[PDB]
């Protein structure tokens, strides 16, 4: 249906893993630090590619604010 590339699928798996442990979605600092990104704008660009294909809503304003929608 809508296929995800390997490093954007690592960003999507950290969103599902923090909801399964805590209830809530992660910050853009947790996505850059826990997966291992040298520039935090590369973690933000893979998060934008997940919203542009159609799998998440980025709630722009809330720090822990990424709502899980679709995969397939």
Swiss-Prot record:
Any one biological process term the GO annotation gives: DNA replication
DNA-binding interval(s): 28-48
Entry GO terms, CC: cytosol; protein-DNA complex
Knockout mutant characteristics: Cells are filamented, accumulate DNA double-strand breaks, have viability defects at 10 ng/ml ciprofoxacin. Synthetically lethal in combination with a priB deletion.
Residue ranges the record marks as coiled coil: none
Keyword terms, alphabetized: Autocatalytic cleavage, DNA damage, DNA repair, DNA replication, DNA-binding, Hydrolase, Repressor, SOS response, Transcription, Transcription regulation
A single GO molecular function term of this UniProt record: identical protein binding
Keyword Repressor carried by entry: yes
Binding partners and assembly: Homodimer.
Family: Belongs to the peptidase S24 family.
Biological role stated in the UniProt entry: Represses a number of genes involved in the response to DNA damage (SOS response), including recA and lexA. Binds to the 16 bp palindromic sequence 5'-CTGTATATATATACAG-3'. In the presence of single-stranded DNA, RecA interacts with LexA causing an autocatalytic cleavage which disrupts the DNA-binding part of LexA, leading to derepression of the SOS regulon and eventually DNA repair. Implicated in hydroxy radical-mediated cell death induced by hydroxyurea treatment.
Protein name: LexA repressor
Organism: Escherichia coli (strain K12)
Lineage start: Bacteria, Pseudomonadati, Pseudomonadota, Gammaproteobacteria, Enterobacterales
Residues of the full protein shown: 1 to 72 of 202
